[PDB]
Each structure stands twice: as structure tokens, then as C-alpha cells.
Amino acid sequence: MEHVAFGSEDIENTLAKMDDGQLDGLAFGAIQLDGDGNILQYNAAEGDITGRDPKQVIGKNFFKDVAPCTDSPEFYGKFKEGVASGNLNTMFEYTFDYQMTPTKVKVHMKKALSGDSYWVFVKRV
């Protein structure tokens, strides 16, 4: 494992160092998105929760194609405000139900340490 706790204060500094191999060692799901919603990285833990094959979702649009259940003011709306503002740090519960057994999760969205990239972290609740 990669020892990083969900919701740590400096999580973006810790994950700046990890390649896809390392992101697969996290105990929670991690998605890296550009400012458009396109998927840059998708770890193994997220695949275990949603059933998606990480390698097959890279390059798709998260809100339009892969996870349309998050295309709502409660998820996408917050993301788009964060991108626009250039700052984002929010945590909330959500239910993932597109093409899967409805699953309650905790979501943490936060701006990456890198210019136009944004993290989505997920864990079961």
C-alpha cells in the first residue's frame, strides 16, 4: 500500500509524486481530471467501486460519458465553479448508480498542485 489517508490536508503534495503504478496502491479511489472533465488518471480502487476498467476510461469525459450520474448541480456544478474560480476543496456524500448497484460514497474534490488538473477522491461509506 501507499500510506495516505483520505481527506489529508496536504494530499495534493503527496500525490504529485506518484505515477499510475503508485496511485493504484491508494486505499481509496482517485481520479485526475483536466478543467474540461476529461480523465487523465483513474486508479484501481475507483475501478473496484464502479466496475470501470481504469485503462479504458482514460481520455473519456467524466461528466458527459463515463459518470453521467454526477452531471448535476451537486457534483458537476461544484466542479465547474472550482475550475472557474481556480480553487476547489469540498467533501460530500453521493450515490453512484449509473449502470451499477447504487453505491453510497464519500467524495473529496480538490485542485491539484499542478495548473489545470483536479482530483476526485472516493471511498465507500
State the nearest-atom distance from the C-beta of 123 to ligand HC4, in Å.
13
State the nearest-atom distance from the C-beta of 111 to ligand HC4, in Å.
19
Nearer to ligand HC4, 41 or 50 (CB): 50
Nearer to ligand HC4, 13 or 56 (CB): 56
Is residue 86 classed exposed, middle or buried when 0-12, 13-18 and 19+ CB atoms within 10 A define those classes?
exposed
- The helix (H) or strand (E) run that includes residue 111 is strand 103-111
Q: CA 118 → CA 11, 40, 100, 103, distances in Å?
A: 12, 10, 25, 23
3-state secondary structure of 50: helix
State the nearest-atom distance from the C-beta of 29 to ligand HC4, in Å.
7
Which positions touch ligand HC4 (CB under 6 A)?
Answer: 31, 46, 50, 52, 66-70, 96-98
- The helix (H) or strand (E) run that includes residue 121 is strand 117-124
d(CA 57, CA 14): 24
Nearer to ligand HC4, 31 or 112 (CB): 31
Nearer to ligand HC4, 81 or 97 (CB): 97
Residue nearest to ligand HC4 (CB): 69
State the nearest-atom distance from the C-beta of 98 to ligand HC4, in Å.
3
